[PDB]
Design a protein around this ligand. Sequence first.
Ligand SMILES: Nc1ncnc2c1ncn2[C@@H]1O[C@H](COP(=O)(O)OP(=O)(O)O)[C@@H](O)[C@H]1O
Length: 331
Amino acid sequence: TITANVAGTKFEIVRLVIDEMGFMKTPDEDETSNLIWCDSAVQQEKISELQNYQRINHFPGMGEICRKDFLARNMTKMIKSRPLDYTFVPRTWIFPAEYTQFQNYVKELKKKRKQKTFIVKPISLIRNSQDHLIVQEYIEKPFLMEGYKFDLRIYILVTSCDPLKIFLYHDGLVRMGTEKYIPGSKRSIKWFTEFLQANQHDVAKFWSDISELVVKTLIVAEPHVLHAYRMCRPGQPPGSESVCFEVLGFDILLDRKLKPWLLQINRAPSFGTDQKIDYDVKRGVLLNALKLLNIRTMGNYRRIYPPEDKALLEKYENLLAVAFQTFLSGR
Ligand SMILES: Nc1ncnc2c1ncn2[C@@H]1O[C@H](COP(=O)(O)OP(=O)(O)O)[C@@H](O)[C@H]1O
């Protein structure tokens, strides 16, 4: 029947959900399983060994948008081509590569008598070495919740890279700060939207900005993923359904003007469940994801690609044309 291999997971909610969908757990050494779940990223050879009926929870080449240094370099090549479309990414400087370039930006800022804050990630701040770090402009005026800075963790389901299909879960995690903000309690996004409603903010625009952010982010990753997949899977017929799917964890910060900024993409987000908020959300994320796969022999998900809007789809396909063009230039 429909079987599963949960040897590569350490989270009970993953096993719980898979057991709840009706999957029969195979012994760990069994590679025949219809579904193969692994927490961390998989070797490309493992994806190449799959059969066309099998489904694994990771795309090959997704590290181009998950690794903060790769994400910075690729987005940079994209900003230079399409700056108006990609404004959701704070300026980032990869070290020890863009050291001199970063110093020049500080030089101009000094002469202009202006000041900016900068965050250093693997974490500390700076107001202006040969180590592998990254420098990023610091969003100084974040959206505060009762005087508190918070983080958004949204969950993205990518079911295919050919044709590209992207789903956005309309719920997630909110990580409020410990001490109040000046220039960790957990909550749900569903609750945060109800907050925005009571405080009269456009919840629809919030989701729309988030959706466009994700698609345009995956658009940057698409040429990397598509090539890796096709070289990993040379035995797939022209219209063969995707062997790979993936649940990505987007870390996102909103500024005072409720503009969503991309911080990182986690291809291996913790599905741990110590609290009830973690349970309901993450179970719903995993359960509905397997539902959409429809493994044979949506719920709180909304398809953001391909969009029902024709005009928006045209813009996306234009960006994809640029993404693939930018892709060939680098390699
Ligand atoms: N460019 C940035 N601008 C403003 N605040 C940021 C920025 N980057 C991170 N913050 C904060 O830094 C924290 C993220 O820490 P990070 O090391 O990148 O990931 P992790 O959560 O695993 O520690 C978040 O609280 C986030 O709000």
